[PDB]
Ligand binder design. Structure first.
Ligand SMILES: [Cl-]
Ligand SMILES: [Cl-]
Lengths: 76, 76, 77, 76
């Protein structure tokens, strides 16, 4: 099944970030499997509507994953 | 598209009822308030199924409930 | 314990609405024991920062509970 | 009190993130009050030694906050 905005809106607010995480994790894992768990947790801070867009836009998710990777990188 | 009824919804599990009502409500709410659509939909899905079925056939009533939900979401 | 914005921010995003719900429910139940579960669920749609303010301000919580009660009220024919 | 690496190291791992969060949050809130909670949660995924450096380097905290803000920025 594909997570729609109506299906997410129908779920209790307590379960929405969990549901988005479950779908985000395999996609992030297909790009950067080593930091996927950490990156997933970070990207879950993004508003739910933007996360639903990212679940359907591979290049938008890619650029956010790359931005999260840069956030984790320590100073030179 | 079929008219949803209280008896037809009562036959399905409670979360499935909310999903069915949510699928009809979300596109209409998004047409009014696209930014808060997901939040408004989630909120309005707490209303009794019979009142929700009325609102799905009464654009005037849906709009006033959406405006009431928007007031609830407004910060102080 | 009182839920601070820093304590909520340190929790995983998957747990934040659940944590806010656990704090909101007893307070809502105290002024509206009837549809407390529904009101809590509705108010959890509000942004987390505004919910943290509402947990500290009884003023804003009561008015939001009253507004939620109005949303639940069925139309008069 | 000033948070030293030895003081942080003496506490359990999750207690360490909460302690760093308590120091990071007011500084991040001063910069971006609306996104403070989200930015703090995301920056807490960074290694504790790099977080302690950022708490003592206002310029490096600012550049990390800006990177986190870009991660949160919606496509529209
Ligand atoms: Cl809007
Ligand atoms: Cl801000």
């Amino acid at each position: 099944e594909t997570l729609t905005a109506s299906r997410l809106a129908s779920a209790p607010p307590q379960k929405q970030k969990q549901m988005l995480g479950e779908r985000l994790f395999p996609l992030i894992q297909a790009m950067h499997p080593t930091l996927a768990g950490k990156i997933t947790g970070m990207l879950l801070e993004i508003d739910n509507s933007e996360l639903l867009y990212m679940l359907e836009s591979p290049e938008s998710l890619r650029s956010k994953v790359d931005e999260a990777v840069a956030v984790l990188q320590a100073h030179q």
